[PDB]
């Protein structure tokens, strides 16, 4: 039954969160550092 | 940009300049060899680093050395 | 190939109704079965003088000698459609490699004087980021692997 | 330099030429005079027909210009040694590149400065332990 | 070549925002959005994970509302890194906040269009006919 | 043109292409190459990195504790450790269907769960932790310790707390503190914990943070420690009928030395482990008083080095103190070497002398831990060599280390490399020839002609410690040797443990062990040869006598002079990685197959098939894969389905590496230029311009990515095989 | 006995501390 452990409403949010958190921020960071550019 | 040096072991045979495909290397009058000339690299901004000079060197080990460095649009050979 | 990966992941997840099989999301090859049926009905339509079909693989009787079979209809389903597309993909990549080996043996945006270097040559120095394996010889060296893989 | 006079070569257009970045960032042009009307191979692909007399062609990078220049003098009996390669900026600024001082860089010439010239052997370069933590290389010193 | 430039193509290549004549950065991606979530609903109409349940017209809607959100970031976050701020001098797509608003077609656009497309498919209009088993008449 | 990525190297920032990103990542921790990096800021950034890394390790351990105390069946496994499978963590995957759901609801859990194979349940029940609350308290304590170390790093990055460069370059004090405190005091405190908690918990006596100040670990307190007589702590040892966790068969001894294996748990004795830690703690504390400090008395390493000269070695070890003390790559290469050797030693010791209760019976956990530590050490050694090459490239001073033992290594490097090549040929030739000969001889229906060499030199060593199955009558195998009549307390336990045909303590070997050992010797000699030629010829050669001017890692030198591909000292590391992986494949095949034979009681299969390669290819690879490939079938899905998927996944990644390793850059640069033209001419797409000019992956990056994919597909595939095939016939 | 429900919530509040201190050390190492 999915959660035989205490506080079963945490693993849910924890899996989506890591899903749309760490690599999203990681891919955005390189982008942002590409943004400064330099038109001369 | 890449770094191109020419050492005193150069005999001034213009081979490295005859092999250079981007007009990076020249020849200036010197006083070390029979030909009285030594290789020169004024336009390092056009040097891609294809090592075509070093391939065309006659002396025992190279007299001209190419050291790759911070690659740019011109050194990367980008045509697009 | 992504179809095979999806089928492996579905059968691994325990989800049979989500597969590309003959018992789920079917991928039936209509054209090949149609031409099979065409070759089957040949002796009585578009070939009155012909008594039997060209091959019994398209459809018809099952000829067998001694205790083993000689040739029988080769039913084409999802597992045949997927492998045919795999073959087409591998042949396409091999053709791409062996074609860029010829359409760029003369020159390219990377090397404009490649025609001077000849047919068989390793490269043109580590410059330009790296000019390794640009000749037509290197393209044939790569196309050998893809012909093998196909 | 002042003006880039020249006739565009007979060519039916190809996809190997210059692009959007090549027009906005920088492009290269080469000017030469042809003794007659003949066919020459394009460094971008195909075979074109150069016009009689002064010609002009724009390319993407410099190596293409020099590859065409090394082709002009070697393949044709009326050899072309007057091909001049220019770099074009997005502001119309055109500067001279090849040949540099009017003479090919092959043979020597008076009026050139020694660039990158060292007074040692390669086996005489200093040890990297003596220059570490400094923004210099064993060949830059 | 005819495909690159012809009679119809010369205008149609020049008819969508970044080539269309005088279109504002607000509508910078009308079609670029009106054509997204409408055809993203196709593969989810008869093939999805929830293709053989009771929500045949729901998984596609939510998946489209997420995929448009992904393609919106892959649009604006890059737009800012290719050009700084304010606007430009040629095309309003190549503009900074202009590209940030190039999503104004994904946003609102798809969130309403892909919404109504399945809001018409989950339902079937209230009009039918039902038998009578009363006897009480 | 420069932008801001990276901020530590202007050269990589000025790159206007996509490469600017890649080399901005692969040079993140190369602090020595940053812009204007001084020698002090270097060491200080590295110090803060050490603090953060200690915190990371402790956070990982805290998570390991948390998931066991939260989702694991620790208390149930304590009841029946030989039949209840441990629980690692619970699954929360919204992609499961029905087969995986019915399968993963295992190990007594009422939900789809993952079995545990890291062998931590046995460790925690051997320590004395018997309830989830103790594990939870430990996890909270580690969560606090990690923050302690994080703040320590953050505070030491401040100028007032910034340690001086002369503080970092202090060798005579760092050692006296790491040995007497980090090694001696730590071992002593751990021995105290083992005596005060582990031993009472083994006898039903619960000792926690609420009663340890009053309950003594022995009926007689600290006064019998002061008594010159110490036999009272040998006392009545735990009898051979002792039962763990209960006071049945338990005595009062805490510091013994009877040796052998606990007959029930098939592991080591707790009193012996505590006594060992006490002895070695005394030894390390004594070691911590050797080098002088602020009190005159003591040694000076710079004098001891510069004093050990030689008539055949010239300068001996002179100036080696000022050499090693200034080279961080030298220090890292020594540390990685020693740590890898002791990691391989931990592996080669825990499988035959297990210290945790009931851990010998679980075969999957024991098969996983050994291979894990062996791969760890196999990376550690390659690192030790890769950093020595960097010492030669960046930190070797030929005038400081002139004529010493280090420079003479460079003076005769040709001979070293030549003899390494000779011994590798002498191995490979004959080992391969004998394997092929055995295969050819067995295939012809004539198994009576196999060249089966008896490993005499190793079986005799086994006899020198008490193994009587061979009967050499030498040293401990002989009852009349003076080594047995010493009244040694450990002798009776050792002699009983070694010869019982149930354990892994000195397994009986034969010709197959001999041949696989010579294949292992080849794998060591050749890998070391590659890693040593890469380090020696890292400063120059006759192809590139100026290799020192090009640094450590560089693409090549060009197609001239015949060719210069894979010529840097980094490329030699890249090549030797393959040999390390092959050696660690051979070693793990050996271990797993022989342990299958020992576990199933079928040592005959291994002892009679490992002499020819077809035995390995069939009776091991093909034979033990049946369940592995049957994790998910057209008939059902069992608990091995995730491993059956990971096997093919590892195959896919391993084969993906082949693309980067076989095809090289220029092809891909041309194929990329075609796509660039395609985009810049596509209507409704050229208006999508790119700041980063897309370029193909460099040659160095090519080899790195290919080797990384190869290594991932090499480790994951073999792990999915080793765990799945073990959790079937015995798990 | 098993683990309580509020203690699992006490775990995240404590884990806030290593996250925050690691953020501080990370930003201090970037310089
Ligand atoms: C540093 C090692 C480590 C690792 C590899 C993991 C890994 C995992 N944890 Mg976890 N966790 C850790 C430490 C770790 N944790 C510590 C020290 C704590 C105490 C604060 C927690 C408390 C915790 C909770 C409460 C939960 C997880 C959960 C999970 C799983 C979901 C991913 C996630 O969002 O994690 C957590 C992100 C930050 C802690 C995942 C397998 C979830 C789970 O059970 O998935 C089924 C979940 O609910 N962890
Ligand atoms: C190119 C190979 C390929 C193809 C054709 C499909 C096709 C499909 N997958 Mg699938 N999948 C693939 C690879 C592929 N997959 C791989 C490699 C994985 C990871 C191993 C998955 C994992 C996966 C999962 C977990 C699920 C699917 C599902 C589906 C179905 C609905 C998905 C959908 O409509 O989204 C939208 C599609 C588009 C928006 C296409 C638009 C692009 C235009 C036409 C161009 C669909 C028939 C889901 C399903 O409902 O099961 C039947 C589902 O649960 N896939
Ligand atoms: C379409 C294929 C697909 C996809 C998208 C996923 C996705 C996921 N799986 Mg999964 N899995 C798959 C196929 C797939 N799986 C198959 C075929 C099997 C074998 C039957 C498994 C067996 C499996 C197990 C045993 C576990 C997962 C877990 C997870 C989650 C990882 C959570 C995490 O660590 O944080 C972010 C994700 C990556 C960093 C994640 C959402 C883990 C989980 O539930 O989280 C704790 C977990 O333990 N999967
Ligand atoms: C008895 C006192 C004592 C103790 C217990 C320690 C303990 C430790 N020191 Mg340390 N050290 C000490 C005194 C001490 N030091 C003194 C006096 C100096 C000045 C010379 C140093 C200078 C020093 C440096 C430069 C470094 C350490 C490091 C370390 C850690 C080793 C890495 C590790 O955790 O692996 C496991 C430990 C045992 C298995 C460790 C916890 C390293 C570290 O990690 O940085 C925090 C490191 O870089 N120490
Ligand atoms: C190095 C870690 C360590 C620590 C922190 C402690 C701490 C303690 N031990 Mg202890 N002990 C240790 C190691 C350690 N021990 C080791 C390695 C042994 C040998 C196995 C012992 C054997 C031992 C005995 C026999 C006793 C203690 C006792 C004690 C407690 C009182 C000691 C005392 O009177 O003050 C310090 C005395 C200075 C002269 C105390 C909390 C006593 C106890 O249990 O309290 C009732 C006690 O009887 N210890
Ligand atoms: C305590 C362990 C340890 C530490 C602190 C380092 C630290 C370092 N290594 Mg290293 N290395 C190690 C173990 C370690 N290594 C092991 C075990 C191996 C064998 C697999 C290697 C093999 C290796 C190679 C081949 C190279 C380095 C390099 C480096 C430097 C740059 C790393 C980087 O930022 O790249 C990126 C980090 C992640 C992508 C850096 C100072 C590079 C260097 O330039 O040396 C100065 C380099 O060429 N290492
Ligand atoms: C360079 C070749 C070489 C190498 C690297 C090894 C390595 C190893 N051998 Mg071994 N061995 C060798 C040659 C070699 N052997 C030869 C030629 C023979 C005779 C056929 C043996 C017979 C042998 C036995 C019986 C045993 C080992 C074992 C071992 C392992 C334990 C180490 C040891 O026993 O001490 C070191 C081994 C030696 C010092 C042998 C001398 C090798 C010299 C230095 C090389 C020159 C040999 C030369 C041809 C001799 C001339 C013979 C003469 C009659 C003409 C180890 C990995 C043991 C084992 O199986 O481990 C489980 C074991 O019991 N070896
Ligand atoms: C490897 C597995 C078993 C294989 C067979 C063993 C041979 C391995 C190949 C090594 C060949 C040795 C070549 C010697 C080269 C040589 O002749 O050098 C000459 C050297 C003379 O040195 P000096 O007399 O000048 O010594 C003065 C010192 O202060 C050095 O400055 O003689 C020796 O060093 C003899 C000892 C060999 C030391 C090298 C290896 C030692 C083996 C490990 C010893 C462990 C001892 C306990 C340490 C904890
Ligand atoms: C005043 C004082 C005295 C009295 C001292 C008293 C009354 C208590 C002293 C306690 C001392 C001095 C040290 C106790 C140290 C406990 C330690 C160091 C525990 C460390 C735990 C670590 C490091 C991590 C453990 C882990 C955990 C958390 C897990 O759950 C997984 C395993 C592992 C990762 C190992 C006397 C008169 C006696 C001597 C003079 C000084
Ligand atoms: C590159 C390089 C380097 C190198 C490194 C290395 C490589 C290391 C290592 C090492 C190792 C890897 C080692 C090993 C070894 C071995 C040993 C050390 C041994 C031995 C022996 C003994 C001593 C024993 C004894 C005994 C016996 C016989 C048995 C019983 C017990 C007894 C004890 C009796 C360096 C960085 C420095 C520098 C730079 C260059
Ligand atoms: C395919 C290929 C390319 C082209 C490869 C390219 C252009 C890379 C494209 C990969 C994109 C970026 C997606 C990769 C996805 C990764 C898993 C992302 C990892 C990045 C981390 C930050 C997560 C080469 O440049 C090359 C060079 C030399 C030898 C062989 C090859 C080669 O085989
Ligand atoms: S080929 Fe080399 S030695 Fe000869 S002139 Fe040119 S640079 Fe000098
Ligand atoms: S390295 Fe190549 S491009 Fe550069 S100067 Fe030498 S020959 Fe010319
Ligand atoms: Ca479904
Ligand atoms: Ca307890």
UniProtKB/Swiss-Prot annotation, chain B:
Localization per record: Cellular thylakoid membrane
EC number of the protein: 1.97.1.12
One GO cellular component term: plasma membrane-derived thylakoid membrane
SUPFAM superfamilies: 4Fe-4S ferredoxins (SSF54862)
Binding site for [4Fe-4S] cluster 2: 20, 47, 50, 53
BP GO annotations: photosynthetic electron transport in photosystem I
Catalytic activity: reduced [plastocyanin] + hnu + oxidized [2Fe-2S]-[ferredoxin] = oxidized [plastocyanin] + reduced [2Fe-2S]-[ferredoxin]
Cofactor(s), names only, from the UniProt record: [4Fe-4S] cluster
A single GO molecular function term of this UniProt record: oxidoreductase activity
HAMAP family: PSI_PsaC
Record function comment: Apoprotein for the two 4Fe-4S centers FA and FB of photosystem I (PSI); essential for photochemical activity. FB is the terminal electron acceptor of PSI, donating electrons to ferredoxin. The C-terminus interacts with PsaA/B/D and helps assemble the protein into the PSI complex. Required for binding of PsaD and PsaE to PSI. PSI is a plastocyanin/cytochrome c6-ferredoxin oxidoreductase, converting photonic excitation into a charge separation, which transfers an electron from the donor P700 chlorophyll pair to the spectroscopically characterized acceptors A0, A1, FX, FA and FB in turn.
Protein name: Photosystem I iron-sulfur center
Organism: Synechocystis sp. (strain ATCC 27184 / PCC 6803 / Kazusa)
Gene responsible for this protein: psaC
Curated annotation (Swiss-Prot), chain E:
Organism, scientific name: Synechocystis sp. (strain ATCC 27184 / PCC 6803 / Kazusa)
Transmembrane segments: 61-81, 106-126
UniProt-recorded name of the protein: Photosystem I reaction center subunit XI
Membrane topology: Multi-pass membrane protein
Keyword Nucleotide-binding attached: no
GO CC, any one term: photosystem I reaction center
Top-level taxonomic group: Bacteria
UniProt-annotated location(s): Cellular thylakoid membrane
Keyword line: Membrane, Photosynthesis, Photosystem I, Thylakoid, Transmembrane, Transmembrane helix
Tagged with keyword tRNA processing: no
Biological processes annotated in GO: photosynthesis
Protein family (similarity comment): Belongs to the PsaL family.
NCBIfam families associated with the record: PRK00704.1-3
InterPro entries noted in UniProt: PSI_PsaL, PSI_PsaL_sf, PSI_suXI
Positions of disulphide bridges: none
From Swiss-Prot, chain F:
Cofactor binding summary note: PSI electron transfer chain: 5 chlorophyll a, 1 chlorophyll a', 2 phylloquinones and 3 4Fe-4S clusters. PSI core antenna: 90 chlorophyll a, 22 carotenoids, 3 phospholipids and 1 galactolipid. P700 is a chlorophyll a/chlorophyll a' dimer, A0 is one or more chlorophyll a, A1 is one or both phylloquinones and FX is a shared 4Fe-4S iron-sulfur center.
Record: residues binding [4Fe-4S] cluster: 556, 565
Gene Ontology biological process terms from the UniProt entry: photosynthesis
Gene3D superfamilies, per database record: Photosystem I PsaA/PsaB (1.20.1130.10)
EC number, as in UniProt: 1.97.1.12
Membrane topology: Multi-pass membrane protein
Binding site for chlorophyll a B1: 651
Catalysed conversion reaction: reduced [plastocyanin] + hnu + oxidized [2Fe-2S]-[ferredoxin] = oxidized [plastocyanin] + reduced [2Fe-2S]-[ferredoxin]
Subcellular location: Cellular thylakoid membrane
Transmembrane intervals: 46-69, 135-158, 175-199, 273-291, 328-351, 367-393, 415-437, 514-532, 572-593, 640-662, 704-724
Main localization of the protein described in the UniProt heading: membrane
InterPro entries per record: PSI_PsaA/B (IPR001280), PSI_PsaA/B_CS (IPR020586), PSI_PsaA/B_sf (IPR036408), PSI_PsaB (IPR006244)
GO cellular component, one term: plasma membrane
Signal peptide: none
Residues at which chlorophyll a B3 binds: 659, 667
Keywords: 4Fe-4S, Chlorophyll, Chromophore, Electron transport, Iron, Iron-sulfur, Magnesium, Membrane, Metal-binding, Oxidoreductase, Photosynthesis, Photosystem I, Thylakoid, Transmembrane, Transmembrane helix, Transport
Database matches in Pfam families: PsaA_PsaB (PF00223)
Family of this protein: Belongs to the PsaA/PsaB family.
Descriptive protein name: Photosystem I P700 chlorophyll a apoprotein A2
Organism: Synechocystis sp. (strain ATCC 27184 / PCC 6803 / Kazusa)
UniProtKB/Swiss-Prot annotation, chain G:
Transmembrane segments: 6-25
Keyword hit for Transmembrane helix: yes
Signal peptide feature range: none
HAMAP family: PSI_PsaM
Cellular localization per UniProt: Cellular thylakoid membrane
Natural source organism: Synechocystis sp. (strain ATCC 27184 / PCC 6803 / Kazusa)
Record-level GO cellular component terms: photosystem I; plasma membrane-derived thylakoid membrane
Topology term for the membrane: Single-pass membrane protein
Superkingdom, natural source: Bacteria
One GO-annotated biological process of the protein: photosynthesis
Keyword Transmembrane: yes
Family: Belongs to the PsaM family.
Name of this protein: Photosystem I reaction center subunit XII
Keywords, in A-Z order: Membrane, Photosynthesis, Photosystem I, Thylakoid, Transmembrane, Transmembrane helix
Gene: psaM
């Amino acid at each position: 039954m999915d959660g035989s452990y205490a506080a079963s409403y945490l693993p849910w949010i924890l899996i989506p969160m890591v899903g749309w958190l760490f690599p999203a921020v990681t891919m955005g960071l390189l982008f942002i550092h590409i943004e400064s550019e330099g038109e001369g | 940009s890449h770094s191109v040096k020419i050492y005193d072991t150069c005999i001034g045979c213009t081979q490295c300049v005859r092999a250079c495909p981007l007009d990076v290397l020249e020849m200036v009058p010197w006083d070390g060899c029979k030909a009285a000339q030594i290789a020169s690299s004024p336009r390092t901004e056009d040097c891609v680093g294809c090592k075509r000079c070093e391939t065309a060197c006659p002396t025992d080990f190279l007299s001209i050395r190419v050291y790759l460095g911070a690659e740019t649009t011109r050194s990367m050979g980008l045509a697009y | 190939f992504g179809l095979y990966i999806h089928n492996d992941t579905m059968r691994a997840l325990g989800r049979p109704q989500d597969m590309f099989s003959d018992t789920a999301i079917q991928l039936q090859p209509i054209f090949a079965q149609w031409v099979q049926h065409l070759h089957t009905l040949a002796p009585g339509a578009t070939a009155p003088n012909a008594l039997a079909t060209a091959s019994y693989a398209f459809g018809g009787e099952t000829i067998a000698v001694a205790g083993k079979v000689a040739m029988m209809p080769i039913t084409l389903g999802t597992a045949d459609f997927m492998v045919h597309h795999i073959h087409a993909f591998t042949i396409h990549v091999t053709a791409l490699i062996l074609l860029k080996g010829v359409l760029y043996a003369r020159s390219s945006r990377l090397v404009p004087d490649k025609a001077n270097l000849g047919f068989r040559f390793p490269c043109d120095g580590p410059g330009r980021g790296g000019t390794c394996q640009v000749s037509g010889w290197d393209h044939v060296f790569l196309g050998l692997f893809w012909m093998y893989n196909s | 330099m002042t003006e880039l006079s020249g006739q565009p070569p007979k060519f039916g257009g190809s996809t190997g030429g210059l692009l959007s970045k090549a027009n906005r960032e920088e492009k290269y042009a080469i000017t030469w005079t042809s003794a007659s009307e003949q066919v020459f191979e394009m460094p971008t692909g195909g075979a074109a027909i150069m016009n009689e007399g002064e010609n002009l062609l724009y390319l993407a990078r410099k190596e293409q210009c020099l590859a065409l220049g090394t082709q002009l003098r070697t393949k044709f009996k009326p050899k072309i040694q007057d091909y001049k390669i220019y770099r074009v900026y997005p502001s119309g600024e055109v500067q001279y590149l090849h040949p540099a001082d009017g003479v090919f860089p092959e043979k020597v010439n008076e009026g050139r400065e020694a660039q990158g010239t060292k007074t040692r052997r390669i086996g005489q370069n200093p040890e990297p332990v003596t220059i570490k933590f400094s923004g210099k290389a064993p060949y830059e010193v | 070549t005819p495909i690159s430039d012809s009679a119809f193509t010369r205008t149609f290549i020049g008819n969508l925002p970044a080539y269309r004549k005088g279109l504002s950065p607000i509508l910078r991606g009308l079609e670029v959005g009106m054509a997204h979530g409408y055809f993203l609903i196709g593969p989810w109409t008869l093939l999805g994970p929830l293709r053989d349940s009771e929500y045949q017209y729901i998984g596609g809607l939510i998946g489209a509302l997420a995929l448009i959100l992904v393609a919106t970031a892959a649009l604006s976050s890059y737009g800012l890194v290719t050009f700084q701020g304010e606007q430009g001098s040629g095309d309003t797509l190549q503009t900074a906040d202009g590209w940030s608003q190039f999503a104004a077609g994904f946003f609102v656009g798809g969130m309403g269009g892909a919404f109504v497309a399945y809001f018409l498919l989950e339902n079937l209009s209230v009009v039918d006919g039902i038998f009578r088993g009363l006897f009480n008449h | 043109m420069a932008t801001k990525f990276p901020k530590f190297s202007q050269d990589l920032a000025q790159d206007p292409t996509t490469r600017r990103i890649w080399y901005g990542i692969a040079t993140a921790h190369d602090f020595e190459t940053h812009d204007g990096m001084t020698e002090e800021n270097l060491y200080q950034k590295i110090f803060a990195s050490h603090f953060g890394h200690i915190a990371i390790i402790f956070l990982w351990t805290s998570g390991t504790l948390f998931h066991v105390a939260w989702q694991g069946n620790f208390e149930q496994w304590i009841k029946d450790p030989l039949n209840i499978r441990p629980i690692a963590h619970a699954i929360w995957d919204p992609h499961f269907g029905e087969g995986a759901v019915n399968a993963f609801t295992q190990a007594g859990a009422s939900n789809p769960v993952n079995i545990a194979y890291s062998g931590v349940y046995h460790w925690f029940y051997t320590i004395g932790m018997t309830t989830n609350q103790e594990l939870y308290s430990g996890a909270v304590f580690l969560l606090v310790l990690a923050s302690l170390f994080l703040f320590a790093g953050w505070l030491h990055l401040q100028p007032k707390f910034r340690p001086s460069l002369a503080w970092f370059k202090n060798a005579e004090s760092r050692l006296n503190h790491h040995l007497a405190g980090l090694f001696g005091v730590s071992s002593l405190a751990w021995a105290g914990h083992l005596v005060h908690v582990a031993i009472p918990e083994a006898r039903g006596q619960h000792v926690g943070w609420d009663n340890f100040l009053s309950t003594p670990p022995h009926p007689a307190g600290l006064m019998p420690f002061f008594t010159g007589n110490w036999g009272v702590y040998a006392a009545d040892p735990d009898t051979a009928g002792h039962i763990f966790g209960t006071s049945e068969g338990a005595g009062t001894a805490i510091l013994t030395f009877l040796g052998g294996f606990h007959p029930q748990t098939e592991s080591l004795w707790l009193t012996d482990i505590a006594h060992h830690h006490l002895a070695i703690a005394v030894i390390f504390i004594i070691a911590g008083h050797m080098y002088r400090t602020n009190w005159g008395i003591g040694h000076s390493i710079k004098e001891i080095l510069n004093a050990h000269k030689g008539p055949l070695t010239g300068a001996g070890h002179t100036n080696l103190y000022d050499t090693i003390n200034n080279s961080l790559h030298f220090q890292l290469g020594l540390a990685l070497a020693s740590l890898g050797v002791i990691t391989s030693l931990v592996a080669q010791h825990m499988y035959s002398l297990p210290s945790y209760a009931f851990i010998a019976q679980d075969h999957t956990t024991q098969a996983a831990l050994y291979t894990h530590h062996q791969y760890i050490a196999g990376f550690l050694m390659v690192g030790a060599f890769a950093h020595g090459a960097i010492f030669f490239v960046r930190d070797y001073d030929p005038v400081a280390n002139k004529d010493n033992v280090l420079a003479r290594m460079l003076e005769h490097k040709e001979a070293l490399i030549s003899h390494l090549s000779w011994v590798s040929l002498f191995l490979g030739f004959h080992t391969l020839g004998l394997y092929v000969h055995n295969d050819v001889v067995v295939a012809f229906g004539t198994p009576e002609k196999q060249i089966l060499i008896e490993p005499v030199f190793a079986q005799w060593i086994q006899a020198t410690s008490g193994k009587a199955l061979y009967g050499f009558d030498v040293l401990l195998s002989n009852p009349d040797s003076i080594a047995s009549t010493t009244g040694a307390a450990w002798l009776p336990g050792w002699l009983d443990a070694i010869n019982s045909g149930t354990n892994s303590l000195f397994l009986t070997i034969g010709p197959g062990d001999f041949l696989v050992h010579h294949a292992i010797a080849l794998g060591l000699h050749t890998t070391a040869l590659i890693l040593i030629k890469g380090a020696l010829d890292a400063r120059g050669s006759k192809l590139m006598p100026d290799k020192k001017d090009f640094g450590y890692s560089f693409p090549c030198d060009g197609p001239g002079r015949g060719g210069t591909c894979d010529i840097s000292a980094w490329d030699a590391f890249y090549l030797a990685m393959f040999w390390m992986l092959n050696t660690l494949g051979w070693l793990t095949f050996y271990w797993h197959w022989k342990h299958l034979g020992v576990w199933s009681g079928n040592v005959a299969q291994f002892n009679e098939n490992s002499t020819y390669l077809m035995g390995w290819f069939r009776d091991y690879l093909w034979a033990n894969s049946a369940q592995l490939i049957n994790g998910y079938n057209p008939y059902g899905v069992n608990n091995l389905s995730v491993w059956a998927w990971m096997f093919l996944f590892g195959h896919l990644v391993w084969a993906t590496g082949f693309m980067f390793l076989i095809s090289w850059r220029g092809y891909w640069q041309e194929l990329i230029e075609t796509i660039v033209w395609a985009h810049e001419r596509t209507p409704l797409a050229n208006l999508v311009r790119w700041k980063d000019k897309p370029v193909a992956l460099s040659i160095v990056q090519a080899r790195l990515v290919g080797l990384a994919h190869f290594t991932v597909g090499y480790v994951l595939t073999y792990a999915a095989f080793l765990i799945a095939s073990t959790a079937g016939k015995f798990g | 006995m098993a683990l309580s429900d509020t203690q699992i919530l006490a775990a995240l509040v404590v884990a806030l501390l290593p996250a925050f201190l690691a953020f501080r050390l990370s930003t201090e190492l970037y310089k």
